[PDB]
Design a protein around this ligand. Structure first.
Ligand SMILES: *[C]1[C][C](*)[C](*)C(*)(*)(*)(C(*)(*)(*)C(*)(*)(C(*)(*)([C](*)C(*)(*)(C(*)(*)(*)([C](*)*)[C@](*)(*)*)C(*)(*)(*)(*)(*)(=O(*)*)[N@@](*)(*)C(*)(*)([C][C](*)C([N])=O)C(=O)[N][C]([C][C][C][N]C([N])=[N])C([N])=O)[O@](*)(*)*)N(*)(*)(*)C(*)(*)(*)(*)([C](*)*)=O(*)*)[C]1*
Lengths: 99, 99
C-alpha cells in the first residue's frame, strides 16, 4: 500500500498470538512495543528517544506479522507510549519513503 | 526521491539562512529542531516521545526547504537529540510510505 501522512500511519500487527496496532516509524531504528507477554528469554537494554531514555528488554528472532507480511527480528518491549515498528523491520517488509 | 530504510532517512534542510540535516520521521506529528537561532515570536509548548516530556518553543509559519522543496509550517525548537521533520511538513512535500 501507499500510505499518506495526513493521518498517523498505523497498522495491525500479530505478535505472539495477539493483535495490536502499531505506528510505522522511519525515525526509530528499532521496534518497541508497550508492555506485553512474550514467550522466551530477554536481555535488558536502554534506548534513547525524545524526553530521555527508557530501560527495555530485548528479544531476538521474534516472529511479527505486519499488515499480513511476515518478518522476524528483534523487538524491544518496555514503556514506550506507543507501539513503534522501526527500520529493523521496515526494511524487511520492503518499505520505502517517496516524495 | 525514493528513500530506502537501511540507513536513517536524513536530508538537508535550509532554515533561517542556515543549512541543517534532519531525519524524516513518520512517527512524529510535529517538526522538532535542535536549539537554534530563529527570528520571531514563539509560545512555550511541550511535547512527548519515548523517555518523557520536553519543553520546546513554538514558531508558526517558518519557511523551510527540505531536500530543496519549500513548505511553510510550525517548527518547534528545543531539547531534541536529532532534528526531526514530522507529518506536518512531510504532507507538505508530498511524502508517502510504500510497502
Ligand atoms: C512516542 C509515542 C508516539 C510515537 C513516538 C515515535 C517517536 C519517534 C521519534 C524519534 C526521534 C529521533 C526522537 C525517536 O525517539 N526514535 C527512537 C526510537 C526508539 C528506538 N530505540 O528505536 C530512536 O531511534 N532512538 C535511538 C537513540 C538516538 C538518540 N540519541 C540520544 N538520545 N542521545 C535509538 N537507537 O534507540 O518518531 N516520536 C516522537 C515524537 O518522539 C513514540
Amino acid at each position: 500500500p501507499q500510505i499518506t501522512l495526513w493521518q498517523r500511519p498505523l497498522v495491525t500487527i500479530k505478535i505472539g498470538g495477539q493483535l495490536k496496532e502499531a505506528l510505522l516509524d522511519t525515525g526509530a531504528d528499532d521496534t518497541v512495543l508497550e508492555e506485553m507477554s512474550l514467550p522466551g528469554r530477554w536481555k535488558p537494554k536502554m534506548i534513547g528517544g525524545i524526553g530521555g531514555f527508557i530501560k527495555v528488554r530485548q528479544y531476538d528472532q521474534i516472529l511479527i506479522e505486519i499488515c499480513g507480511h511476515k518478518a522476524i527480528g528483534t523487538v524491544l518491549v518496555g514503556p514506550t507510549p506507543n507501539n513503534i515498528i522501526g527500520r529493523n523491520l521496515l526494511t524487511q517488509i520492503g518499505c520505502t519513503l517517496n516524495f
